Amino acid sequence: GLEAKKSHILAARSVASIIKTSLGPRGLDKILISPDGEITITNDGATILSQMELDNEIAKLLVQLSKSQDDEIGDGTTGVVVLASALLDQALELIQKGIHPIKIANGFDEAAKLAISKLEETCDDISASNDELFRDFLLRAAKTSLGSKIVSKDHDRFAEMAVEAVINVMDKDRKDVDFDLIKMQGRVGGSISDSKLINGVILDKDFSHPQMPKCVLPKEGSDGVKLAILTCPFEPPKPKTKHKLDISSVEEYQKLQTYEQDKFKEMIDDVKKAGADVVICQWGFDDEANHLLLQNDLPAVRWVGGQELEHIAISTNGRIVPRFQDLSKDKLGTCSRIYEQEFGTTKDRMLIIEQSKETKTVTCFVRGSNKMIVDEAERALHDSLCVVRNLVKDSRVVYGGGAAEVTMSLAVSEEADKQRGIDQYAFRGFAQALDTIPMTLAENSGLDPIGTLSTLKSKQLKEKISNIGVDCLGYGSNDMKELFVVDPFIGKKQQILLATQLCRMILKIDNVIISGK
Amino acid sequence: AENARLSAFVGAIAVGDLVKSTLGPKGMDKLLQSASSNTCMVTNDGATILKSIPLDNPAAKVLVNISKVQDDEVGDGTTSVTVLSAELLREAEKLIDQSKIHPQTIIEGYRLASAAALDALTKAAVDNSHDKTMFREDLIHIAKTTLSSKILSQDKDHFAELATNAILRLKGSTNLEHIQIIKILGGKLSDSFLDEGFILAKKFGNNQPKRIENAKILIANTTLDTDKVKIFGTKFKVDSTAKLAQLEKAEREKMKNKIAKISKFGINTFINRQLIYDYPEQLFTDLGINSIEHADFEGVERLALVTGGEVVSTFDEPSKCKLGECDVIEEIMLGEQPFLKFSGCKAGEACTIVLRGATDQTLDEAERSLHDALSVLSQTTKETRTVLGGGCAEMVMSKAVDTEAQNIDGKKSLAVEAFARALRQLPTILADNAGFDSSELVSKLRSSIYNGISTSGLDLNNGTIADMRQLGIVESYKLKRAVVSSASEAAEVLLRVDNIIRARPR
Amino acid sequence: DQVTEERAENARLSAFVGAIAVGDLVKSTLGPKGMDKLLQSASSNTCMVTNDGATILKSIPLDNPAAKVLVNISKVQDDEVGDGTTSVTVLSAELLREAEKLIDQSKIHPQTIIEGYRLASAAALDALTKAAVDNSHDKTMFREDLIHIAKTTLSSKILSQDKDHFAELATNAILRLKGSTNLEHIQIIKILGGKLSDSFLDEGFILAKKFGNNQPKRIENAKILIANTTLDTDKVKIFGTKFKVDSTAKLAQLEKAEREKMKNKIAKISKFGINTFINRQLIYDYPEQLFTDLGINSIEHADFEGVERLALVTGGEVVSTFDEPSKCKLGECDVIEEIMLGEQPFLKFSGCKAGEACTIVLRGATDQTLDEAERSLHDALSVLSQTTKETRTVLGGGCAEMVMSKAVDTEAQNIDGKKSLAVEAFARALRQLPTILADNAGFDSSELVSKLRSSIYNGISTSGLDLNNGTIADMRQLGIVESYKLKRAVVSSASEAAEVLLRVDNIIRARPR
Amino acid sequence: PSNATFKNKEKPQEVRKANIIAARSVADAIRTSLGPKGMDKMI
């Protein structure tokens, strides 16, 4: 009956109590232990719920909800999912009051519709501004929100490179953002402030022979080596089926080697006839073919993945080569400079390919002082092309940080008294639970939750500016406009809508039947 | 704070207390006894210690990754990296609980202290660069600082001349594969020899001469094992054994034609990657050419850097590629097994250091000493700044940390001063192994730097305060910056843990 | 066999953590703002919730001998202060914790650490003696300062919010005793029900017994007699006697002689001229009717503890051997009547002949407060009685521990050497006692204590910590003051007990029988 | 200016939580027996 309601709510309250300290830039990190012992330290609620022992299906629904939310903005994931959990406590009282669960779910849906028009009131328009202000706004927008962990001290070095990375991949005609073109690397050593940005593709793997020269000199061409991608395996042709070679004489058995010796020569000559220098493939090399490969000054790499060749094909602007018979001068790539650098002490090297002209392949060099930081860096390094994708899709820009949730709550609260009926205790219960985001910011910053609402009510109500919010950085002003706390309109709009759509299901749960796994 | 972080503080300190006896030049080595294979290893460096020890605390396993960073970058004195982070966890047990301060604020106090620590390391750095005459002579005393942290220090003055002449033969080579370290059982550490050439642990053939002058050495990746392997999925189709007996015998002459192509080079020495059959081995005797085999991978690679040659697979052209030449290749028997001693290399492309010791545990452990010492010599050539160690660097930073605490003031000064107090505990732990008075030595060093004397330092040999420049204690800026910046950020992540999630074991 | 012995390696760490683990429960009980604890007993399924560790730590089984001596010395604190005495175990635990960090840093021999506490305790006695204030020279301010002394010592229990109603209880009661230090004179009765503030101080005695049958509930101008003689059981003998008779005629004569035994016994009682009679044991039906025929009150079932309190409060004397009627004294009260307090009606006495003792009526909401108010009133007037003997007092409430820190810091400069580390460690551990007190009220123990530390060094003795407002307030304005005799025994015994625990290099566990 | 905090033990309710739950089971018992519309029990 109704006893199962508290069973699902207390299960979410235990999860919300754990991630309560995970909200805001001042929050703390959880350790994620794998069954094999691998340690993962991150503040992302989606990653914490990804690897964990979960019983109730509600915790699994939070992962499905985080999949669509992480694809919108990509920061402050804790300050989103937990907002829907606070509505269960307000709905628990409505169950004690006798309100039907459907009347509770339909009440949260109608109250969330008014938040669309109130949020777009004061939103700034960045489309009228030029590309200079577009880069200045995006630069200082993430600095507060982006880093929740570790490098969030020195993150200013990462923010400057994150803005210059999108300019190369995004043309000036309209605005277009593709986050699959820019890869994400990482290293263990040095310091976190040594990260650099080079225009081109960077392969983490190095040459397969010790005597291969590390750096290449410019030549009569673009100064590149005219890199080409060879998909065909490097080896003498082997029939995929069985082959029986009849040997009637010593010459027939000796000429079997003469074949592959000529195949190794013709394979290398075709590279010299076209003028190519560095040629990489997916498969390995032979023992005898490495000598003629080195003597002809033809650096090469083996066991190259297919995902890396995608960004390489964009930098070279060539074509994929299925067979050695397709090698030609017109199919060669165009690059500027290619350098190879050894990293920690004895650690392996990497091929950094530079592009003089503006291209769509930008690889940001990543360096870090701990392996746990690198696993943490996977979430921390690149949120950028997800955040700017919301700015380029919708030019409306608002200011977050807990300020807008209180403003839109008072707007719905005033509209709740106009409808009266059962919508009074309903809409007010929804707006009253939306203050948990700034209230949690008052937990880390050590501010009075009662004084938190009284401060924003004495300002955002009388004054039309809604930017008044909780300051966790310890400054002398609560205005988010001066402190440069920026969240995208359409991005934060989805975070509010998807959080309310979660209550259309959980609130209606009555009977649960779990069959054997 | 209480149940959230419990074993993260005391548990990490208990791990550092085990390696506390390993810190410092007067420290001692810990025995690592594995529960499996019944083996053992004796190592001072915490890279191997923390890796093989079972760690129930997840925070202790994080200390292994930060140890691997200092293992590759520095590798010597890495014990103080995890110990310095353990003292920050002890001070966090109070300020967070007793003083009731949010952990992020304590972290922010260390964040501002880390920025002030970098300013004290750069301004106090001493620039040794330009002329390499006094520079190389100073490298003798500069190396002795981090050269021996072990009980083997009796070899300091002996290996000081060998390590100095090692980089002299490299002539600016920053690759650690260009140096050859040989580990030989028996003898004494003072019996280590350094010559120009390479000494291989293999031997020559049966009839190969013991002394050959002006020999031309050439290696290759081919396989002389037997016959010809050809391609995959072959077979022999013949009418009878008359043709089959000829096919097997003719390929022995076909390989001789490849050996006849070797004779066109005029080389006096041949080296093969894989094993060699007796028939092509005897053909090398008729031509008077030495043979070397049984090299898995690096066997032919280590000799290529010394001789400066090139792997020739085809043997087609006696013009291009490379031909290496050594003055005297004579086989010289050292210890029990006979060794192949090369001398008079064509160039200084590589070098070889021979080490001898009675205990096998001394050979493996002292290998890391010269391996890390040459890395320091390469950093002193690149990075031109050096600092002074021996407990003095921690008190100099404490002067800058206490200075910044006066500007910040507030309640964050408790976290800033705790960072300075954590820097005061490192020389206390450093001098704890020597067994001398902590209150006497620290007070004389801490007060002397506030008086304007930065040349003082802790002397654990005589148990007093002496000049680090006279005793020859010098640390490069690359070594000091890598340890402080990593250890300051190592505990920064450990203080961010508000909960412990234990997964179900497999 | 099966003897587990720990050398100086294991015993040094195990002995220090033993007092810290169990000591964490008594750290939150310090001061009026301190909290309480709960204990689950496996027998009878009872519990005791109080801030005094004398009834807490005694019922907690512990295998660490370090806290065993801390429980035995609590009886000395139970004989002196009795309220808020957990600081003895808290300060001792801090001395063990600071010495544990002192041996891990200074690494001096433990005997040298003890020698530092010996010189540090001498400086603490000088600060308390020079700051001692004796107001007994003025009788007007002396009776008013007893209220200020009361307000400090009478805040323990959850009911301390009623201290304003309970301050008048101990103020007038200590004036009625006039030098009576014994609790046997003080009459403490428990009553279930009524409001928490309903407790009042009445002049007289309150008896929980009643009258058997015909005894009038209201008797005026009565002579109270206390007798240990046997009534209910009558003939019980205990001789070497046996009974042999020829016929049932003389059998009834023995019962007739039993009547003559009581008729001659009541005749000697009638010669006393008393309207009230009290027995230690029960009263048989036959003398019960004789008491009503002669107009004599009957009171029975007075135990060994209650038979004394009757004569001690009323000033009477327990009378036996009735053959001497005029050789003893008879108690007298103005009004003897039965009243109703709570559910059970009680017998009230008024106008006692001797005002040497008083009766404190205690009414409360729950049974948990019955034993809780008993512990708060265990030492109440006795604490005020010790102030009547030793009249030198000093401002308490956490400031006195800070005043002694200035004397220890001053003595540490004259000592110096390597023994000053243990002397300074005693000063650092002593300043942590008010720090834990500030932690109990949830206020700031960092900025406030730091200001109180500099205020003592600036020469202000009256500076202290305010519990209600959480600020710096003078103890003379708040009225927080403690006697010199109580605080001297708390600081000295805490340091003497800590010297023994630091001397344990071995722990031997014998095989249980 | 932040300061504040004053937390130390992070589970002050842990002792006072399950006891209210144990008291709620007793409290929910009288809710069914309250008023003339209530219910009876058997022991």
Swiss-Prot record, chain A:
One of its GO terms (cellular component) is chaperonin-containing T-complex. Its main location: cytoplasm. GO terms for molecular function: ATP binding; ATP hydrolysis activity; ATP-dependent protein folding chaperone; unfolded protein binding. It is found in: Cytoplasm. GO terms for biological process: chaperone mediated protein folding independent of cofactor; protein folding. The keyword Ion transport does not apply. The keyword Disulfide bond does not apply. It comes from the Eukaryota. InterPro entries: Chap_CCT_epsi, Chaperone_TCP-1, Chaperonin_TCP-1_CS, Cpn60/GroEL/TCP-1, GroEL-like_apical_dom_sf, GROEL-like_equatorial_sf, TCP-1-like_intermed_sf, TCP-1_chaperonin. Keywords: ATP-binding, Chaperone, Cytoplasm, Nucleotide-binding. Coiled coil: none annotated. Pfam families: Cpn60_TCP1 (PF00118). Molecular chaperone; assists the folding of proteins upon ATP hydrolysis. Known to play a role, in vitro, in the folding of actin and tubulin. In yeast may play a role in mitotic spindle formation. Belongs to the TCP-1 chaperonin family. Heterooligomeric complex of about 850 to 900 kDa that forms two stacked rings, 12 to 16 nm in diameter. PANTHER family: CHAPERONIN. This is T-complex protein 1 subunit epsilon. It comes from Saccharomyces cerevisiae (strain ATCC 204508 / S288c).
Swiss-Prot record, chain C:
It is found in: Cytoplasm. Its main location: cytoplasm. Keywords: Acetylation, ATP-binding, Chaperone, Cytoplasm, Nucleotide-binding. GO terms for cellular component: chaperonin-containing T-complex; cytoplasm. Pfam families: Cpn60_TCP1. One of its GO terms (biological process) is chaperone mediated protein folding independent of cofactor. SUPFAM superfamilies: GroEL apical domain-like, GroEL equatorial domain-like, GroEL-intermediate domain like. One of its GO terms (molecular function) is unfolded protein binding. Molecular chaperone; assists the folding of proteins upon ATP hydrolysis. Known to play a role, in vitro, in the folding of actin and tubulin. In yeast may play a role in mitotic spindle formation. Belongs to the TCP-1 chaperonin family. Heterooligomeric complex of about 850 to 900 kDa that forms two stacked rings, 12 to 16 nm in diameter. Interacts with PLP2; this interaction leads to inhibition of CCT complex mediated actin folding. PANTHER family: CHAPERONIN. This is T-complex protein 1 subunit beta.
UniProtKB/Swiss-Prot annotation, chain D:
Molecular chaperone; assists the folding of proteins upon ATP hydrolysis. Known to play a role, in vitro, in the folding of actin and tubulin. In yeast may play a role in mitotic spindle formation. Belongs to the TCP-1 chaperonin family. Coiled coil: none annotated. It is found in: Cytoplasm. Heterooligomeric complex of about 850 to 900 kDa that forms two stacked rings, 12 to 16 nm in diameter. This is T-complex protein 1 subunit delta. Present with 5530 molecules/cell in log phase SD medium. It comes from Saccharomyces cerevisiae (strain ATCC 204508 / S288c).
